[PDB]
Amino acid sequence: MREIVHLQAGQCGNQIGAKFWEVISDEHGIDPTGTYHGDSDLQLERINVYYNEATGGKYVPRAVLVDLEPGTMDSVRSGPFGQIFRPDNFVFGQSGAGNNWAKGHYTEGAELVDSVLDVVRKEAESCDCLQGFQLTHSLGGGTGSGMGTLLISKIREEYPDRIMNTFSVVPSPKVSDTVVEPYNATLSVHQLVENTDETYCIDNEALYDICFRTLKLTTPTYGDLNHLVSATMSGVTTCLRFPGQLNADLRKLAVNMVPFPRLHFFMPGFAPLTSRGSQQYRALTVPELTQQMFDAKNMMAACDPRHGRYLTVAAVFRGRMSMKEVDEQMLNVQNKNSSYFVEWIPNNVKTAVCDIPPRGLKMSATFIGNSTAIQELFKRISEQFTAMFRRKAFLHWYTGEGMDEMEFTEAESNMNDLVSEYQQYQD
Amino acid sequence: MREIVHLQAGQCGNQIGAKFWEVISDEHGIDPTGTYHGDSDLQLERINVYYNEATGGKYVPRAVLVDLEPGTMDSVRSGPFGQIFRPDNFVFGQSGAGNNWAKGHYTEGAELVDSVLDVVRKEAESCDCLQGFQLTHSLGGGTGSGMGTLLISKIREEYPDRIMNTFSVVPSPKVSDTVVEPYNATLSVHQLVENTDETYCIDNEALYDICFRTLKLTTPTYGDLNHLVSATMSGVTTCLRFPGQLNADLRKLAVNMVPFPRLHFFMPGFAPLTSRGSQQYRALTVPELTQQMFDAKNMMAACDPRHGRYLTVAAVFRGRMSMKEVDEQMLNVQNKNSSYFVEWIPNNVKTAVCDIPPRGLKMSATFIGNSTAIQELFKRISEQFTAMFRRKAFLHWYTGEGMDEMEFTEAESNMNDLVSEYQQYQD
Amino acid sequence: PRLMTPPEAKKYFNFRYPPAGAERVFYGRANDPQIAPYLTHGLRSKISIP
Amino acid sequence: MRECISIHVGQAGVQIGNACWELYCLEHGIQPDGQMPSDKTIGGGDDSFNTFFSETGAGKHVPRAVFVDLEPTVVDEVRTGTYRQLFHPEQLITGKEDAANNYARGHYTIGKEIVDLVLDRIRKLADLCTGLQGFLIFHSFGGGTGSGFASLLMERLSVDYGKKSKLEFAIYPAPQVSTAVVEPYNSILTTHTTLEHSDCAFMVDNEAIYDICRRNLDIERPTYTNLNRLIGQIVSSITASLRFDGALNVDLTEFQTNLVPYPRIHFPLATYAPVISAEKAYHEQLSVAEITNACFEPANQMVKCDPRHGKYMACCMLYRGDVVPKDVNAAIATIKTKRTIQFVDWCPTGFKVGINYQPPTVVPGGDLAKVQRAVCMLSNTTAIAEAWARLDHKFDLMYAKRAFVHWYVGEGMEEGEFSEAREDLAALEKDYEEVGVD
Amino acid sequence: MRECISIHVGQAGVQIGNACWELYCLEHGIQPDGQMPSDKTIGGGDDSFNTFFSETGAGKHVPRAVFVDLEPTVVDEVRTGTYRQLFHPEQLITGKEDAANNYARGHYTIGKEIVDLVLDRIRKLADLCTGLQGFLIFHSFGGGTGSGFASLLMERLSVDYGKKSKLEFAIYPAPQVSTAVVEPYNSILTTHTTLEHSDCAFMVDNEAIYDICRRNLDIERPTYTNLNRLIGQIVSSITASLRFDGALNVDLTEFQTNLVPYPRIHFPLATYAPVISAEKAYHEQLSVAEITNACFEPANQMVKCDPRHGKYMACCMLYRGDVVPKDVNAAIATIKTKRTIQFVDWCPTGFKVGINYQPPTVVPGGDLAKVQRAVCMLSNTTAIAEAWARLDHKFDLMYAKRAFVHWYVGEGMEEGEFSEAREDLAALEKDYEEVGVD
Ligand SMILES: Nc1nc2c(ncn2[C@@H]2O[C@H](COP(=O)(O)OP(=O)(O)OP(=O)(O)O)[C@@H](O)[C@H]2O)c(=O)[nH]1
Ligand SMILES: Nc1nc2c(ncn2[C@@H]2O[C@H](COP(=O)(O)OP(=O)(O)OP(=O)(O)O)[C@@H](O)[C@H]2O)c(=O)[nH]1
Ligand SMILES: Nc1nc2c(ncn2[C@@H]2O[C@H](COP(=O)(O)OP(=O)(O)OP(=O)(O)O)[C@@H](O)[C@H]2O)c(=O)[nH]1
Ligand SMILES: Nc1nc2c(ncn2[C@@H]2O[C@H](COP(=O)(O)OP(=O)(O)OP(=O)(O)O)[C@@H](O)[C@H]2O)c(=O)[nH]1
């Protein structure tokens, strides 16, 4: 059969996944000890896509934890589900990070890439035939970008025939905390654009705005943000693990979103977001879900695509629906804003229907978007580099490691090509 | 089916709408919690005209509350039926009003229109097919004038094919409290005439007089006055919601009441008004209803049309009656005062019979009239505007926000044109 | 959570909102409380046997 | 065989269509279920119902009529009535939007996407019919939806089927009573559109019907129920020849040929003589003589036209019940000797008599009398021109002051169509004037 | 004898396949166990099932179909269903990898190692069959799996077996609705591959299937259940001739010869006239005439085509039920006299009638009517070319800017084969009007 193996990288991806596996486990109903409580036949059915079998009915998560710093993993192993997580999968370095990209990409990685490669192939040999791999990390993450860029390069030649799913969070546009953060962006996204086939784009500021809008709870946890994004990743994965007349394979999807190779960056979209009173104030009806599905406020990924247009739209629906309300609703939105699509392609909707509702709500969905709204994103950073490369701030660290500004010249040149590329296709 | 969505604006209309809304629920028998206690099939059948239904038997009003001052809304929310209204529908700004027309029309409304237009188009997408909109506000009210004049312009271009009902109250002629009110009125009524199609004219001085007349209870609450005006609006809406061979559509009525485009200003008329002993001293007969219906003392809107004549008269009757008595009573008034109509049009009466009596009484009616009694209204303000425009009192404020005397010139010039227009076609 | 519907409000909820078991088929207000002895007999008029 | 298809347009004309079909189910004894008792009248659908009902082998009587209107309020309510199971769901043509009393709005804005539906019903009704002598159209001149929609529909049925008869029954506008002032607008629009396609139009007015209620029926407070009963009786009597027989049988085709003198003017007047309260008829006696004096009595007509202000051309007398020609032909001969009865000399004879042995029965819960001998007086007289003469001086005023013009031109119309109707009306009156001239 | 083999490719083609066998087991009274009650119908496998089932000495009716798919979920899900015991597990051929909507991937990458196993089933079913008139292929044009795999296998069954019929049935792509933009790639790929090997192709469209549900069935949300029940009735109706008899018996061999005029074009249209809701037909009657008025009515066909925008050459009606030829030939003569129906004059006669006395039965828990007189309409018109005309302008722009081409050439393909189809579809379109023009 066809399975999925995950990699968690960067200290964010440490917090990202840890919420994400607990989302999966509780949905499937396994206790914190690991003894599955048999309640649903279908969740016992397609658990093998992500978990292997240990003795006594314990399903090992087939993911490998990689880091450099103890404390971040110290929390997750001491966390609620660290026991189900594998110390064998806990690979780490005996050094600190410094949030320096070159150190993790040239210095610290060298003595750790060997171990992680030997690890990942061991689970690769353990399982039979993948769809591909997925990664939780950050492009703005110091150790996450540094390690992943190395690993994505090495995994390409090892298995160039599978799916290179990448889940990276974009830092806050207004403030990046890390001051050398844009430098990390160039070094990451430059290599990302070739090796990857799929990329998810996530921003925390929108997650903050989502909290003010629908959460309305003033003071959240970052784990709440982890919970929100895990719901987003879970929805697209419910496609594979659950029945219903929907075609779920990522390549079944990827060919449907990607008209041209350079299109790797995609924006997500989620389904009903509710407030304190709206739960009992809402008639859970197909129109208002789809209306709330296509809300510029329900946007959460990077920014508003109103400034641009839509390349492709793909939303997968979870609940007890029928083939016609999805049919009529697209016509309504198609006629609503017909001009805001591109005249290059008409009818860019790619819908899947999952009949297995979630646990806690019945009628749900998930949306993945590729619009013409990424320009401002790399435009925003573009002024930063043209500024901070004018006199080369913070240069002596990386140059001391063995960095040369020539590497920066092509990295920006590659992106400015993408600047025109995204521009030219739509404009 | 054809539905209606309500707009609640101005610090007055903040009061009326709740009183209006609680009457309708009490008419239909919904408890304050919102769980309709089903007792009448027809009110169950035709509640869809104004309400949507949530989960668990909860009729959500399709009304929009807008203001700037929180304490009014908090009092409204803490009211007997605030739980029935949605925090989604509670939209407001982050500034005090100051009772300035232009601050809400140019400064504060600018960043608040985006929100409400999004809200009103959300509810527009929620409903299928509309008759139109109704707006409860005041013409002498600073916040209602600024926002109302803004929104009526905006709603025109988005849906110029619906009913733009407006419900405004004329401030007291003897004293306007607000001394800048004649500026506020002249500005608003200018913008109103082009954008509106219906206007309800109500003045409170008549309401106090009626309280001395039939209520006789000396000291009422303004909410009781709201209970009076709401009954007028309830009856004109009983046409649509209730069965019986009465032609209910406002367009069915509008083409009947409106001879020519500029005729937007109209007077209400209500049926049996009864005092403490007369409830059991009244022989409730169609002749005596029509007598009290056509009483100059029953006038409540502006003033006595005795000074002028009658262009269009239309009264809707509610109860278990017959065509013949209303027909003979119709012909009595023609013979009664044949000279006090216009020779322009004979048989200027329009009649509709609602077979469904109200809850609390059986014989009832509502009257809508377009008589030649509005000359005194705007001619009154004419001397007001001229004297205050004579020496530009209180002007440095409006020059501060960005206004000029030139806007005043055409607004009154437009006003003067309508002064003549009402004059020529009757005199 | 609250009950799905008041005991007398199901019919109009089903009529006004077709989601009576998803967006289901509703007939007119008349037949809402009527008995329905229809699903057992036939539809065609007859076959004229000569 | 002998059948027709009835048409019911307008939320004015929908309750009256119910009552006649209610009245119709009484005389043939239809139980509200849709079937007879165990008695045998069902079959291939060939019995007293076959001319009106389609009672196929399923045993359910299907009225051969279509109820069309544009507001769901009344139609869904009558779909909540007692015989709704008899009524075909989408022969009850409902609507979601109104014409707002505007003829052209009901003629142009919404008529396009509804006529295709009803035409499907017509052809799928026409195919199952065998003879289909014509059509029975119920409408109104002052039609909020009756005016515009009937006018458009009567076009295609005329152009597609121009070989069969068309029966037009409508309430005439009240002369001095006006519930609406756009009524003169659409009414004159209907006349100029219908004069060249309608076969035979028959007008009635409510006020005189109300006047009859408290003169002899002795009801100062009647209702539609009795009003629709009377016209329901009226159409029932004219259809008795289709239902039952007599010494001779007459048909609408003979009615058409023998009533309308010349083209254009096809507007006769109907009147039913034995309209008397129940207790009066008991201690009195009905015979052909006195009832015929009543039918030719000037105030007996339901339309405000004055017989000695005009002159008579045609006359139809449908003797439903137990009568013999002997007293029949004697009484009419005395009328020929009567001097006040001033017919036009162009017709030495203008009398069309129809006898039907079946006596007119009472209706349970009704207000009529126990009629053994009855008649409908169908006649045309020159006394009708004043009604349109009332209309034009009514119409000419507001047209000069172009009241409500913005409304009609707002939805896309112009004054040329308003212009054409006035000389059309002028043409009829001068046509009416010349024919009155010897 | 008189038997055939059903082919169900792609999970889109399997839930429909589940329904028909669910339907088929009903009219034979097949219990979900797989055996009859104590009654005597089993033997050497020779009774009404012998043409459909294989009920050998074991007493279990073995369906004569293979349900092949490349995603195991539903086929294993249906393997947990109700009749899974009847179904043979390796006649329920499953796959472990999908084609990603790519025709070539399902045509080249994986189909090679699977078709041989499928061929094993075919030959091992061929040996037990005796007459095996032909094959019944259920598929889809816009197949994530149905498109690519069917093409290769329908070649392989053609090359080894070029002496028998192959009956293919697929959903046509919705003209204005498309779940993806890959279908214009694979569908036109399927068309050019099939035409020189396909025998007679029949298409249908789900929108109109939905449209009729809330037109006459009055269902505003049906499901695949009803959708498969409708088409299952369609395939049941065409297969009644093999099951039972009538006034005359016809075969798919006659269907091919008398329907296709000339090579290449083998694309007729299917329709069922007595589609109606439950409560409707109870209080009316259906006969040969109105259903014939219904059958050829332009809005009653499940394909978005206006017959007045084309011309007819073939029309096959399959009267399942008890009808006399008298009203049959009388009705079609009136249809022949109809002027709107513009047959091509190349065919004076174009009517192929199939009479089967057996009344079509209902499905328990169903939504159809219970009717005795029914007809399935098999007809072809030149009002179909605009569908491909719609697809080519859909395709031509996209090929110019070559979207998703990297996906296809990435797995080893090129543009020459894509080039072949556009003039081939141009070849298809110029053939259509040339036979259209006289
Ligand atoms: N875990 C976590 N990460 C956050 C949070 N908010 C922002 N981030 C960012 O997520 C990024 C990814 O973390 P890692 O890739 O593991 O970081 P690193 O490689 O160890 O080095 P740094 O990025 O400098 O921290 C960080 O760079 C943070 O800037 C948060 O609340 N929790
Ligand atoms: N709510 C309320 N309003 C009243 C009452 N009596 C008079 N009004 C007038 O109704 C008007 C309409 O209120 P709004 O339009 O909300 O007034 P505003 O825009 O906030 O500014 P102001 O008119 O100065 O209050 C007010 O201007 C009052 O002058 C009353 O008893 N209750
Ligand atoms: N034929 C008929 N007319 C009635 C009845 N009751 C009242 N009327 C009169 O008939 C007129 C109805 O005409 P319209 O208003 O144009 O009717 P419509 O065109 O179907 O559309 P509406 O405006 O909605 O009624 C009214 O003005 C009444 O005066 C009735 O029961 N039958
Ligand atoms: N035949 C059929 N089609 C369906 C059904 N439900 C939805 N569809 C439509 O039919 C199409 C099926 O085509 P594909 O998705 O390519 O089917 P496939 O090639 O077998 O591969 P999958 O994607 O796994 O289903 C879908 O795009 C739907 O739009 C169904 O039950 N049967």
Element (H, E) at A46: none
Probe ligand 1: pick from A138, A175, A205, A225, max atoms within 8 Å of CB? A138
E158 within 8 A of E151, measured Cβ to Cβ: no
Instruction: Find out whether A256 and E182 touch, Cβ atoms under 8 Å.
Output: yes
Question: Who contacts B6 (Cβ-Cβ below 8 Å, separation ≥6)?
Answer: B17, B50, B61, B62, B63, B64, B133, B134, B136
Contact assessment for residue B146 and residue B100, using Cβ atoms and an 8 Å cutoff? yes
> Among D171, D178, D204, which is best to mutate for testing ligand 3, by the most ligand atoms less than 8 A from CB?
D171
Annotated binding residues of E for GTP, written as ranges, equal: 11, 71, 140, 144-145, 179, 206, 228
Task: Count each helix (H run) and each strand (E run) in chain C, helices first.
Answer: 1, 0
Cα–Cα distance measured from residue B135 to residue B6, given in angstroms and rounded to the nearest whole number:
6
Query: D158-162 — which CB contacts under 8 Å span 24+ positions?
Result: D158/D197, D161/D126
B331, amino acid identity: L
DSSP assignments along A214-273, one per residue: II--SS--HHHHHHHHHHHHHHHHHHHHS-SS----HHHHHHHH-SSTT--EEEEEES--
* Cβ proximity of B18 and B148 under 8 Å: no
Breaks (C-N over 2.5 A) in chain B follow: none
Q: Can you tell me the distance from the alpha carbon of E3 to that of E118, in angstroms, rounded to the nearest whole number?
A: 19
Residue B143 labeled ligand binder: yes
- Does residue B53 sit at the A interface (CB-CB below 8 Å)? yes
Q: Reply yes or no on whether D284 is catalytic.
A: no
CB atoms within 10 A of CB B211: 17
Which residue owns the Cα nearest ligand 2 atom 4?
B12
E338 Cβ under 8 Å from any chain D Cβ: no
User: How many Å lie between the centroid of ligand 4 and the Cα of residue E10?
Assistant: 8
Is residue E388 within 8 A of residue E428, CB to CB? The reply is yes
* Distance in angstroms (rounded) separating the CA atoms of residues E355 and E317: 9
Task: Decide: residue B375, CB within 10 A, 0-12 exposed, 13-18 middle, 19+ buried.
Answer: middle
Q: Which 3-state string (H, E, C) describes B210-235?
A: HHHHHHCCCCCCHHHHHHHHHHHHHH
Q: By three-state DSSP, how is residue B371 classified?
A: strand
**Which pair of tokens denotes residue D181?**
């002032």
**In whole angstroms, what is the distance from residue D9 CA to residue D153 CA?**
10
How many CB atoms are located within 10 Å of the residue D385 CB? 21
The β-bridge partners of D137 are D7, D168
Please give the Cα distance from E9 to E66 (Å, whole number). Answer: 8
The token duo for E22 is: 């669910």
Q: Which two tokens stand for residue B283?
A: 């022989």
Spatial distance between the Cα atoms of A344 and E394, rounded to a whole number of angstroms: 11
Spell out the residues 6+ positions from residue A1 whose beta carbon is closer than 8 angstroms to its own: A48, A49, A128, A129, E72, E96
Residues linked to residue E380 through DSSP beta bridges, in sequence order: E314
Determine D/A contact with 3+ CB pairs under 8 A as the test: no
Q: Which of A315, A316, A317 is nearest to A362 (CA)?
A: A317
Token pair listed for B235? 């009856």
Rounded to 10 degrees, what is the CA torsion of B167, B170, B171, B175? Answer: -170
**By C-alpha distance, which of E316, E315, E322, E317 is closest to E246?**
E322
Q: Which residues contact A403 (CB under 8 A, 6 or more apart)?
A: A102
Distance between CA atoms of residues B94 and B96, nearest Å: 7
Name which of A370, A378, A366, A375 is nearest A310 in CA terms.
Answer: A370
CB-based contact B368:B271 (threshold 8 Å): no
- C23 and chain A: CB distance < 8 Å anywhere? yes
Q: What is the DSSP letter of E173?
A: P
Buried b / exposed e along B86-105 (16+ C-beta atoms within 10 A): bebbbbbbeeebebbbbbbb
Concatenated DSSP letters of D347-370: -S--EEEEEE-SPPPP-TT-----
* Rounded-to-integer distance, Cα A14 and Cα D109, Å: 64
Q: Distance of CA A297 to CAs A300, A303, B118, E212, Å?
A: 8, 10, 11, 38
C-alpha–C-alpha distance, residues A143 and A105, integer Å = 8
**Parallel, antiparallel or unpaired: strands A129-138 and A2-8:** parallel
Rg (CA), chain E: 22
At A188, which helix (H) or strand (E)?
helix A181-195
Q: What kind and span of H or E run contains A102?
A: helix A101-102
Residue E172: DSSP 8-state: P
- Identify the bridge partners of residue B267 per DSSP, sorted by sequence position: B369
CA distance A159 to A162: 6
Instruction: State the Cα–Cα distance between residues D51 and E288, nearest whole angstrom.
Output: 22
Q: B264, B51, B302: which is closest to B169 by C-alpha?
A: B302
Binding-site residues of D for Mg(2+): 71
Q: CA end-to-end span of chain D, whole Å?
A: 42
- The residues near D416 (Cβ < 8 Å, ≥ 6 apart) are none
Q: Which run of H or E residues covers position A53?
A: strand A51-53
Residue type present at position D310: G
Cα D148 to ligand 3 centre (Å): 13
Residues in chain E: 438
* Contact yes or no for C16/B52 (Cβ under 8 A): no
Tell me which residues have their CB closer than 6 angstroms to ligand 2.
B 10-12, 15, 97, 99, 137-138, 140-144, 171, 177-178, 222
The CA distance from C1 to the nearest CA of chain A, in Å, is 8
Contact status of E340 with chain D (Cβ, < 8 Å): no
Q: Which residues pair with A52 in a beta bridge?
A: A60
Closest CA to B141 of B92, B173, B101: B101
**Can you tell me whether residue B269 is helix, strand or coil?**
strand
Pairing mode of beta strands A198-203, A163-170: parallel
The three-state (H, E, C) secondary structure of E223-269, written as one string: CHHHHHHHHHHHHHHHHHHHHCCCCCCCCHHHHHHHHCCCCCCCCCE
What residue owns the CA closest to ligand 3's atom 32?
Answer: D12
**How many alpha carbons lie under 13 Å from residue E223 in its C-beta half-sphere?**
15
Q: Would you mind telling me the total number of residues written for chain C in this entry?
A: 50
DSSP label at E205? -
Identify the CA nearest to D156 among candidates D196, D197, D206: D197
CA-nearest residue, atom 23 of ligand 2: B141
The two three-digit tokens of residue A216, written as one number: 């309305």
Q: Between B55, B87, B122, which is nearest A283 by CB?
A: B55
Way it was determined? cryo-EM
Which ligand 2 atom is at minimum distance from the Cα of B138?
12
SS3 E271: strand
D357 touches D241 (CB < 8 A): no
Q: Strands, DSSP E only, in E151-243?
A: 165-171, 200-204
Tell me how far apart the 2 most distant CA atoms of chain D are, in Å. 67
**E17 ligand 4 Cβ < 6 A:** no
Q: Distances in Å between the alpha carbon of A293 and those of A271, A320, E270?
A: 6, 17, 38
| Distance between C49 CA and the closest CA of chain A, angstroms | 44
Work out whether strand D65-68 and strand D92-93 pair parallel, antiparallel, or are unpaired: parallel
Query: Nearest Cβ partner of A320 from C1, C2, C22?
Result: C22
Look up residue E309 and give its DSSP letter. G
Closest CA to B294 of B350, B236, B369, B231: B369
Q: Whose CA is nearest to atom 13 of ligand 4?
A: E143
Q: Which amino acid is located at E40 in the chain? A: K
- Residue D404's region, left for phi above 0, alpha for psi from -120 to 50, else beta, is left
Task: Collect contacts of E361-368 with beta carbons under 8 A, ≥24 apart.
Answer: E361/E26, E361/E27, E363/E22, E363/E23, E363/E26, E363/E229, E364/E26, E366/E229, E367/E217, E367/E219, E367/E222, E367/E226, E367/E229, E367/E277, E367/E278, E368/E229, E368/E230, E368/E233, E368/E275
Asked if A403 and A100 touch (Cβ cutoff 8 Å), the reply is: no
- Say how far apart CA E61 and CA E64 lie, in whole Å: 9
Mutate to test the pocket of ligand 3, among D145, D168, D169 (most ligand atoms within 8 A of CB): D145
Beta-bridge partner residues of D356 = D320
**Cα distance between residue B245 and residue D14, in whole Å:** 11
Q: Is the CB of D349 under 6 A from ligand 3?
A: no
| Of C8, C16, C29, Cβ closest to residue B53 | C16
Q: Which ligand is nearest to the CA of B73?
A: 2
- Give the phi and the psi of residue E166 in degrees, each rounded to 5: -135, 115
Question: Which single residue is written with the structure tokens 């000396």?
Answer: B218
Contact B237/B356 with Cβ under 8 angstroms? Answer: no
Pairing of strands A163-170, A352-354: unpaired
Contacts (Cβ under 8 Å, ≥6 apart) of D38: none
Tokens read off for A45? 């059915």
Of D27, D155, D254, D417, which is the active-site residue?
A: D254
β-bridge pairing D312-321 and D373-374? antiparallel
b/e per residue, E332-362, with b = 16+ CB within 10 A?
A: beebeeeeeeebbeeeeebbbbbbbebbbbb
Pocket flag, ligand 4, residue E187 (CB < 6 Å): no
- The identity of residue C47, as a single letter, is I
Is E370's Cβ below 8 Å from some Cβ in C?
yes
Q: Which residues of chain E have a CB within 8 Å of the CB of C42?
A: 370
Residues found in chain B: 427
Which residue in the block uniquely carries the two structure tokens 């065609």? C44
**Dihedral, CA atoms, A361, A367, A368, A373, nearest 10 degrees?**
-120
Q: How far apart are the first and last CA of chain B?
A: 44
Phi/psi at A50 (5° precision): -120, -30
Q: Is A145 left (phi over 0), alpha (psi -120 to 50) or beta?
A: alpha
In this structure, what token pair is assigned to residue E89?
Answer: 């597990």
Distance between CA B98 and CA B398 in Å, rounded? 13
For the packed helices B323-336 and B286-293, what is the interaxial angle rounded to 10 degrees? Answer: 40
Chain C residues closer than 8 Å to A322 by CB:
22-23
Distance CA C29, CA D79 (A): 8
The residues of E annotated with a catalytic role in the active site are 254
* A-C contacts at Cβ under 8 angstroms: 11
What does the alpha-carbon distance between residue E304 and residue E302 come to, in Å, rounded to a whole number? Answer: 7
- Are the Cβ atoms of A280 and C1 closer than 8 angstroms? yes
Query: CB contact, 8 Å: A337 with chain C?
Result: no
Which uninterrupted H or E stretch holds A181?
helix A181-195
Side-chain half-sphere exposure of D365, counting CA atoms within 13 A:
5
What's at A268, amino acid-wise?
P
Alpha carbon separation from B383 to A294, B182, B389 (Å, rounded): 54, 10, 10
Query: What Å resolution does this PDB entry report?
Result: 6.5
Please, where are the H alpha helices in B30-180? 41-45, 70-77, 101-102, 110-126, 142-158
